[PDB]
């Protein structure tokens, strides 16, 4: 039971690392948009 729960916990830690990566990707695109809009303004 406990071993199963630890693995489940670890899977959540991974799911959170993937969200962090997805966050930094959106932020990067939003930043790109702001810079590009500024260059072309």
Ligand X SMILES: COCCO[C@@H](C)CO[C@@H](C)CO[C@H](C)CO[C@H](C)CO[C@@H](C)CO[C@@H](C)CO[C@H](C)CO[C@H](C)COC[C@@H](C)N
> Which residue in the set 3, 39, 40, 41 belongs to the binding site for a second copy (CB under 8 A)?
3
Distance (Å, whole) CA 2 – CA 18: 24
What residue has token string 């916990």? 9
Tokens linked to 2: 């406990």
Count, residues in the chain: 41
The entry of a second copy, ligand X, none that residue 9 binds, CB within 5 to 8 Å by partner kind? a second copy
| Residues of the shown chain interacting with ligand X in the complex, contacts defined by CB under 6 A | 26-27, 30
The entry of ligand X, a second copy, none that residue 32 binds, CB within 5 to 8 Å by partner kind? none
For the chain, how long is the longest CA-to-CA vector? Answer: 60
Nearer to ligand X, 27 or 35 (CB): 27
């Amino acid at each position: 039971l406990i071993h199963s729960l630890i693995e489940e916990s670890q899977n959540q830690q991974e799911k959170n690392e993937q969200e962090l990566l997805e966050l930094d990707k959106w932020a990067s695109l939003w930043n790109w948009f702001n810079i590009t809009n500024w260059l072309w303004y």
